[PDB]
Amino acid sequence: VAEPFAKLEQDFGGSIGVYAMDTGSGATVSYRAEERFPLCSSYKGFLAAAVLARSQQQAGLLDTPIRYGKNALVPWSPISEKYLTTGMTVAELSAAAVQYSDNAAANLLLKELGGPAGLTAFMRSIGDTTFRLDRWELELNSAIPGDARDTSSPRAVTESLQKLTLGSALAAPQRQQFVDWLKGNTTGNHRIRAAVPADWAVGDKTGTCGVYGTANDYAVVWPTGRAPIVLAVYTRAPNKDDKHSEAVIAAAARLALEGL
């Protein structure tokens, strides 16, 4: 089982972490599934989930307009930047955070939740004890070896995604909104999506720290007429200038799906 992944992570020059779960059969694949990896932008899926969970207690939260100044803008905010003159609702910021990895939107939503500690508190509320977000955009992307900040494990990411997209953690309408946002993600076509047949529905959230060969993807997959699959592929590398590889993420994802 682990043999194909070790092979892959030695063509890549760094570490690959993989965890996949068949929700019907209960079969799993694990490879470095309990090691910590930098979240990079991938926490933004759970951010949107946390915002949805809070809207269950705070009616009208999703429609709340957030009017921000030019100061709220940080690099890689392609949606947020376009609406500087009108603002965006919490729901619009959430879709932007998920589907375009919009950094200003994420910081705005983090603020709504009480900062990185607020998001970590939400992940604890659903029983995730591994996840930790400690910093804001963009410092959380530093991905320095040995730093436990802003990390989780492939297994913890998979279990939390499972609880949120298929389980009871979100109420029924919020749960479908979360799934819909992941399904409409625009940044992951070359990662986990590239490993499934095009006739299978996929929702995913990517992460790309830009340094230390650190990039990732987690996804829910619906095989046609089949129980849904949940999986996470995370990578890192020892040298700051080591390049991440979308191909390696897709190859790792295919090995996980061909192995369940």
Ligand SMILES: *C(=O)[C@H]([C@@H](C)O)[C@H]1CC(SCCNC=N)=C(C(=O)O)N1
């Ligand atoms: C998140 O990981 C980073 C961080 C700088 O906020 C941004 C950069 C990118 S943009 C395209 C990356 N390539 C493939 N996805 C994303 C991202 O979508 O991963 N988030």
